[PDB]
Subunit: 123 residues, 4 copies
Amino acid sequence: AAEAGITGTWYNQLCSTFIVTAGADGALTGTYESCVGNAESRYVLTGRYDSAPATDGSGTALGWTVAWKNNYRNAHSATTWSGQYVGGAEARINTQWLLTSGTTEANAWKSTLVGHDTFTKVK
Amino acid sequence: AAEAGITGTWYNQLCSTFIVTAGADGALTGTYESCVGNAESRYVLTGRYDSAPATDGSGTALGWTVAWKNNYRNAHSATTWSGQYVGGAEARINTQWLLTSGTTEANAWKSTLVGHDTFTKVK
Amino acid sequence: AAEAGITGTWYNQLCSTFIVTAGADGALTGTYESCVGNAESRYVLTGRYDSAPATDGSGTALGWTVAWKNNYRNAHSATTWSGQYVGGAEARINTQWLLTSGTTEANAWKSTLVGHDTFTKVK
Amino acid sequence: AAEAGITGTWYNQLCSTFIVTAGADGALTGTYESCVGNAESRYVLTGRYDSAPATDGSGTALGWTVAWKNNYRNAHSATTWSGQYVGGAEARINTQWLLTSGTTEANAWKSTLVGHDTFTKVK
Ligand SMILES: O=C(O)CCCC[C@@H]1SC[C@@H]2NC(=O)N[C@@H]21
Ligand SMILES: O=C(O)CCCC[C@@H]1SC[C@@H]2NC(=O)N[C@@H]21
Ligand SMILES: O=C(O)CCCC[C@@H]1SC[C@@H]2NC(=O)N[C@@H]21
Ligand SMILES: O=C(O)CCCC[C@@H]1SC[C@@H]2NC(=O)N[C@@H]21
């Protein structure tokens, strides 16, 4: 149910696009495009999901990472999204994220932004 | 420098073990073993790192995910670590993490733990 | 504008109630009632807000704390909300929060939940 | 034990100073001085702590807020620290924090930094 539900195109609350394949082994592979920040076009993502989730109505735990380097830009930063997939007619991936920039040691205290993204199958 | 510095075995501040290969393409692949929580033995990890970091003394941004399912246990949860690699004689990976459990919608507000891990090359 | 806008009753996305007075000195004082977790009735809150915010269209930074002890219950925990007030016809307080429980040292790694609350003037 | 243990001067891992009084009613009052960021001299803090903590060896949950406005500077930002006090010969306040800046709606996704501070009675 989770494998067959996660694979595809997802859209966050504004204008970012998350394209993912959920493998039978628990792998997440695809691309991410952010409409905000120091980013242009698609970036590689990889992650993991629970490939045997509970059947009690609980969501499916997952996470993925994007390092913000591609052929066009390098922001010297990486975001991880940690969350859960919720199935049904209004399917959702509800996440919180951590965006860490490469910094000097003196600036390390301010290296990491935190936020949240909600993904849907329709933009 | 970052590719040649990240690959290997890392140990957190207590008793967890992070085994990773940093690929030329920006990939992180390996295994994680936690000495705490609902976990036993090794779990698959995958992630991304900045494969062309700044040369100004800044750290190398990275992140990875573990879904807490293996052949022994399934915690129905996933952790993402977001952080930076700092090179030199006392090499470090400094991270913050988000641990999301699969929950019901009613319990989603309490789905996610936050913390921090510091990894070194010596335990 | 911020002082005259923050004072009053606020409601989160589900069923919690945030009653606050914004003082001229930057103080936040009031009570919080949560409809979830180990909580019953009202709890004291105190916090701070920027009493001279920017006039460029930016929000007003603020934060507050609740320790989850009152005359009825003690959860041995505390939540801090950090966020910004956004004025106008659809006024909002957009927050992220950290909920720390008192733990043993062995369990400290799992002491802290993270989430987000959006408050409006209408439930 | 917690009331008699929290009151006083605390120092973080680098060069910040946290001066606090823990009241019998659960109040935290005092001043904070940061050696980093857009900050100079002392700022008002207020917070809450569990004034009847568990006696089983668990820490004492607490939190506080600083809005980064004083007579010298206004950063248009606020930090909340959420954590626990650990008593004994090497007393500690272990915290995680959220630093929210006032932003435009377009920039709200990057409003909030996350980190951690460990406070001791000796610098
Ligand atoms: O500016 C950077 O360092 C790289 C781009 C970051 C974009 C962030 S990732 C979290 C949030 N969700 C999005 O879709 N975009 C932003
Ligand atoms: O209990 C679970 O849900 C699975 C195990 C979680 C272990 C966590 S991940 C973050 C922290 N760092 C570690 O090395 N272990 C804990
Ligand atoms: O269970 C506890 O430890 C005390 C109650 C916690 C309620 C939390 S605080 C963050 C979130 N927002 C709410 O309104 N309620 C929950
Ligand atoms: O730059 C600002 O917006 C105001 C100063 C922020 C200082 C932060 S608060 C968290 C961390 N701990 C400290 O002692 N200082 C920094």
